[PDB]
Amino acid sequence: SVQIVYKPVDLSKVTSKCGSLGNIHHKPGGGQVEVKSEKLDFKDRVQSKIGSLDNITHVPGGGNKKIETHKLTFR
Amino acid sequence: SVQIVYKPVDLSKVTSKCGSLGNIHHKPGGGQVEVKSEKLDFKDRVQSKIGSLDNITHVPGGGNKKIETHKLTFR
Amino acid sequence: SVQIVYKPVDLSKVTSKCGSLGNIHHKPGGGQVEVKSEKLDFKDRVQSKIGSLDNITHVPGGGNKKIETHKLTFR
Amino acid sequence: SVQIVYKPVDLSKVTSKCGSLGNIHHKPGGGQVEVKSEKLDFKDRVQSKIGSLDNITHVPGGGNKKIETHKLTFR
Amino acid sequence: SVQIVYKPVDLSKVTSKCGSLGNIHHKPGGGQVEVKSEKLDFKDRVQSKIGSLDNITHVPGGGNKKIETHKLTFR
Amino acid sequence: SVQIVYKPVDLSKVTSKCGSLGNIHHKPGGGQVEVKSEKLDFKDRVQSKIGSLDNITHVPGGGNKKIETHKLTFR
């Protein structure tokens, strides 16, 4: 005479809040930007960004991972 | 006479909130941007961005992954 | 005469709050920016950023991971 | 052999006479008002009132509150 | 053999007379008001009131509160 | 053999007279008011009031509070 009852329960929340969240930027103001260049020389890849006000968010991460396993065996 | 009951339960939430969320940009203002260039020389790939106000979000990540396994065996 | 009852329960919160969260940037102001360049020379990759006010967030991390295992055995 | 008699009595006035009451503004006079404006400039919310005579009442308060409880309990 | 008689009595008046009461403003007079403005500049919320005679009452308070409790208990 | 008689009595007045009461402003007179402004500059919240005669009352307080409790107990 044998009886087995297996009833594991899971409610575990897995959460990631990555980047810029809930922030308040009330009335920000970028000032005047002047850029001047003369007779410059470049012999490889040039990368440039110019701007009075910039707001950047970048998230290569934040990815959640969950692994689980339920096993039972008899004789 | 043998009895087995297997009834695992799962309600586990997996959540990712990646990037820019719930932010408030109340009345932001970009200032004047002036760019001037004369007699420049470039001998490879040029990449350029110019703008009074910029807002950028980039999320290569944030991807959730879940693995699960339910196994039973008898004799 | 044998009876087994297996009923583990889980409500565990796993949480990451990575980056900029809940901040208040009330009326910030970037000053005037003037950049001048003459007769410069470059022989490798040039990278440049210019701006009166910048706000950057970058999150390669913050990714949660959960591993779990439930095992039972009889004879 | 037990007797209880329970007969609390209440006549308590709870009263508020808030704001402006019983006042006598006998023959008041507002004088001449002149407002002159030239070349003004406004860049967020403007609120304005102009008048020779103003007579104002404002009552966020005055709110009466009562809580009471009669209880009895036996064995 | 027990007898109990419970007959508390209350006539307590709770009264608030908050603000302007019974005042007599016999023949008051506001004089001439002249306002002049030239080339003014405003960059945030502006609030303005102008007037020869003002009579203002404001009552956020005065709210009465009463809590009471009658209890009896036996064995 | 036991007898109890409970008969507390209350006639307590709780009174607040907050603000301006019974005043007589017999024939008051505001003088001439001249306001002049030129080339002013504002970068913050501006609040302004101008007037020949002002009569102001403000009452955040004056709120009465009463707590009472009648309790009896046996064995």
Contacts across the E-F interface (CB distance below 8 Å): 278
Q: What angle do CA F64, F68, F72 make, to 5 degrees?
A: 175
Rounded to whole angstroms, the Cα distance separating B38 from B57 reads: 33
Breaks (C-N over 2.5 A) in chain C follow: none
Alpha-carbon distance A21 to nearest alpha carbon in chain B (angstroms): 5
Are residues E68 and F68 in contact, defined by beta-carbon separation less than 8 angstroms? yes
Paired with B35 in beta bridges are A35
Rounded to whole angstroms, the Cα distance separating D48 from D45 reads: 10
F70 contacts chain D (CB < 8 A):
yes
Closest CA to D20 of F63, E66, E62, E50: E62
Of C16, C29, C72, Cβ closest to residue A31: C29
Q: Say which residues have a Cβ less than 8 Å from residue E75's Cβ, sequence separation at least 6.
A: D74, D75, F74, F75
Alpha-carbon distance B32 to nearest alpha carbon in chain A (angstroms): 5
Instruction: Return left, alpha or beta for F35; rule: phi > 0 is left, psi -120 to 50 is alpha, else beta.
Output: beta
Q: Neighbouring chains of D at 3+ CB pairs within 8 Å?
A: E, F
Q: Neighbouring chains of F at 3+ CB pairs within 8 Å?
A: D, E
Experimental approach was: cryo-EM
Alpha-carbon distance B29 to nearest alpha carbon in chain C (angstroms): 10
Maximal CA-CA distance, chain C: 94
Closest CA to B38 of A75, A38, D38: A38
Cβ atoms within 10 Å, residue F45: 12
Q: Annotate C43-64 with b (16+ C-beta within 10 A) or e (fewer).
A: eeebeeebbbbbbebebeebbb
User: What tokens were used for A44?
Assistant: 């490889």
Closest CA to D47 of E45, A26, B71: E45
Taking an 8 Å cut-off on Cβ atoms, the answer to whether E31 and F32 are in contact is: yes
Provide, as residue numbers in chain A, all residues whose Cβ is less than 8 Å from the Cβ of C1: 1
Alpha-carbon distance F72 to nearest alpha carbon in chain E (angstroms): 5
Among chain D residues, the shortest Cα distance to F26 is held by: D26
Paired with B10 in beta bridges are A10
Burial of F58 (0-12, 13-18, 19+ CB in 10 A): middle
**Chain centroid to CA B48:** 24
Residues 15-54 of D with CB under 8 A from E: 15-54
Are residues A65 and B61 in contact, defined by beta-carbon separation less than 8 angstroms? no
Q: Say which residues have a Cβ less than 8 Å from residue D55's Cβ, sequence separation at least 6.
A: D25, E55
